[PDB]
Structure 1
Amino acid sequence: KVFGRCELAAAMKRHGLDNYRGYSLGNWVCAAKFESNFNTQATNRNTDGSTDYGILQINSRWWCNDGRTPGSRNLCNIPCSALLSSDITASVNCAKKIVSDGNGMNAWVAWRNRCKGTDVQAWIRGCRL
């Protein structure tokens, strides 16, 4: 599923991301845009051989099992394929664990390099949520 901007903002809000660990909704929308272009089916291989999955590009190195990431963990206790569903529940719940891990949204390098410090409210501007 490729979400529209405001449709994903509304969904992430419904799923409890707005101000989660202090990160306003536009932070999550901005991260999703640059991670996945709002595509739940997005996959990208990392240099180390792990892969990132779904709207928020959750890495198999730590968070999900894909059967091909040596020495990795599965801290969200989910197959990585679950992260590609049109239903964002698994992605959101796993993201909650990630952002609570100590470095907040800096876990998402694209968030750090492209969203942090910027006017992230622009991502939800005009949206019926």
Structure 2
Amino acid sequence: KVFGRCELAAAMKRHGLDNYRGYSLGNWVCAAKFESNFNTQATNRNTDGSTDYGILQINSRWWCNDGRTPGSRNLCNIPCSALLSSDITASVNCAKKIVSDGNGMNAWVAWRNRCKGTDVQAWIRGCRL
């Protein structure tokens, strides 16, 4: 599913991501924009052989099981395929664990490089939330 901008903001809020660990909704929408362009089916293969999955490009080295990332963990206790669903529940619940791991949203390199320090509220501007 490719979400609309406000549609995704609303879904993220519904699932308790808004201001989670102090990160406003615009941060999460911005991260999703640059990780996946709001496409739940997004996948990308990393140089180390791990793969990133879903709207927030959650990585199989630590967070989910895909059966093909040697030496990896599955800390969200989910198949990586769950992160591709039109229902963002699994991605949100896993993201909550990731952002609580110590480095906040810096875990998402694209958030650090493209969202951090910017006017992230622009991502939810105009949205009925």
Normalised TM-score (structure 2):
0.99
State percent identity of aligned pairs: 100
| Alignment correspondent of 1:89 | 89
| Alignment correspondent of 2:128 | 128
How far apart are the structure 2 equivalents of 1:40 and 1:128? 22
Instruction: Give the secondary-structure state (helix, strand or coil) at the position aligned to 1:44.
Output: strand
How far apart are the structure 2 equivalents of 1:121 and 1:46? 30
CA offset digits 1:34-65 (Å, max 9, x no partner): 00000000000011000000000000000000
How far apart are the structure 2 equivalents of 1:84 and 1:97? 18
| Alignment correspondent of 1:69 | 69
The structure 1 segments of at least 4 consecutive aligned residues displaced by more than 2 Å after TM superposition are: none
Q: Which runs of 5+ in 2 are unaligned?
A: none
Q: Which runs of 5+ in 1 are unaligned?
A: none
How far apart are the structure 2 equivalents of 1:4 and 1:100? 27
- The Cα of 1:128 is off from its aligned counterpart by 1.0
How far apart are the structure 2 equivalents of 1:99 and 1:46? 20
How far apart are the structure 2 equivalents of 1:83 and 1:20? 19
**What is the aligned residue count?**
129
Matched, 1:100 2:100: yes
Instruction: Give the secondary-structure state (helix, strand or coil) at the position aligned to 2:10.
Output: helix
How far apart are the structure 1 equivalents of 2:47 and 2:127? 36
Instruction: Give the secondary-structure state (helix, strand or coil) at the position aligned to 2:44.
Output: strand
How far apart are the structure 2 equivalents of 1:47 and 1:128? 40
CA offset digits 1:8-51 (Å, max 9, x no partner): 00000010011000000000000000000000000000110000
- The Cα of 1:117 is off from its aligned counterpart by 0.1
Instruction: Give the secondary-structure state (helix, strand or coil) at the position aligned to 2:52.
Output: strand
How far apart are the structure 2 equivalents of 1:60 and 1:122? 31
